[PDB]
Amino acid sequence: IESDLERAEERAELSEGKCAELEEELKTVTNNLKSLEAQ
Amino acid sequence: IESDLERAEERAELSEGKCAELEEELKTVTNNLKSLEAQ
């Protein structure tokens, strides 16, 4: 169970980093869309 | 440790749900942006 826990924490951290990267990409794309929607 | 694994799995599945939702949102928004830019 300790072996389960260690890589479970590792993959949770990796998924959190991926979530942060995806959120940053969403922010960038929504700023781009807001800029383009002017005209 | 069983409780730790339980809420770690809960947070994990929430993470994949958020990742899937944001990925599909990015796909649709990029498709819309490309279609609008094509004009």
UniProtKB/Swiss-Prot annotation, chains A, B:
Changing residue 9 to G: In CMH3; no change in homodimerization; decreased in hom odimer thermal stability; decreased in actin binding; increased calcium-dependent regulation of myosin binding to actin filaments; dominant effect in the homodimer. The molecule is in a coiled coil structure that is formed by 2 polypeptide chains. The sequence exhibits a prominent seven-residues periodicity. Binds to actin filaments in muscle and non-muscle cells. Plays a central role, in association with the troponin complex, in the calcium dependent regulation of vertebrate striated muscle contraction. Smooth muscle contraction is regulated by interaction with caldesmon. In non-muscle cells is implicated in stabilizing cytoskeleton actin filaments. It comes from the Eukaryota. The modification Phosphoserine is found at residues 3, 15, 35. The gene is TPM1. Belongs to the tropomyosin family. Homodimer. Heterodimer of an alpha (TPM1, TPM3 or TPM4) and a beta (TPM2) chain. Interacts with HRG (via the HRR domain); the interaction contributes to the antiangiogenic properties of the histidine/proline-rich region (HRR) of HRG. Interacts (via N-terminus) with LMOD2 (via N-terminus) and TMOD1 (via N-terminus). Changing residue 4 to N: In CMH3; no change in homodimerization; no change in homodimer thermal stability; decreased actin binding; recessive effect in the homodimer; increased calcium-dependent regulation of myosin binding to actin filaments; dominant effect in the homodimer. It is linked to Cardiomyopathy, familial hypertrophic, 3: A hereditary heart disorder characterized by ventricular hypertrophy, which is usually asymmetric and often involves the interventricular septum. The symptoms include dyspnea, syncope, collapse, palpitations, and chest pain. They can be readily provoked by exercise. The disorder has inter- and intrafamilial variability ranging from benign to malignant forms with high risk of cardiac failure and sudden cardiac death. Cardiomyopathy, dilated, 1Y: A disorder characterized by ventricular dilation and impaired systolic function, resulting in congestive heart failure and arrhythmia. Patients are at risk of premature death. This is Tropomyosin alpha-1 chain. It comes from Homo sapiens (Human). Detected in primary breast cancer tissues but undetectable in normal breast tissues in Sudanese patients. Isoform 1 is expressed in adult and fetal skeletal muscle and cardiac tissues, with higher expression levels in the cardiac tissues. Isoform 10 is expressed in adult and fetal cardiac tissues, but not in skeletal muscle. It is found in: Cytoplasm, Cytoskeleton.
